[PDB]
């Protein structure tokens, strides 16, 4: 499923990521405009082997099981598969884990080179929330 913007910063906050660790909507719609460009069914490959899933782009080295990683803790417990749902569930309880883990969103590595620092409420302006 391709999200509208509006449509995935109301899915978000329903899921309770609006100032989530102190991260505002704004930096979660950010975050996956940039990883995913807000399409669940995205997927794509890591220099060091593992893959990104999903809307949020979750790493198989330490999230989720793709079984073809080979350092791969599943620390949400989950198949990688179950992060390409059109329920964006599973990427928001798993997303909730990671940014609780020490270095905050910048585990994305898009957020940091491309919301910090920025007018990041700009992405939800307009939306009805
Ligand atoms: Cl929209
Ligand atoms: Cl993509």
Redesign the pocket.
């Given at each position: 499923k391709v999200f509208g913007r509006c449509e995935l910063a109301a899915a978000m906050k329903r899921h309770g990521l609006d100032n989530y660790r102190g991260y505002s909507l704004g930096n979660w719609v950010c975050a996956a405009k940039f990883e995913?460009?807000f399409?669940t069914q995205?997927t794509?490959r890591n220099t060091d082997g593992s893959t990104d899933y999903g809307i949020l782009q979750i790493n198989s080295r330490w999230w989720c099981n793709d079984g073809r990683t080979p350092g791969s803790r599943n620390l949400c417990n989950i198949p990688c598969s179950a992060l390409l749902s059109s329920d964006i569930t599973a990427s928001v309880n798993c997303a909730k884990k990671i940014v609780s883990d020490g270095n905050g969103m910048n585990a994305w590595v898009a957020w940091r080179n491309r919301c910090k620092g920025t007018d990041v409420q700009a992405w939800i302006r307009g939306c009805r929330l």
């Open positions: 995913s460009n399409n995205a794509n």
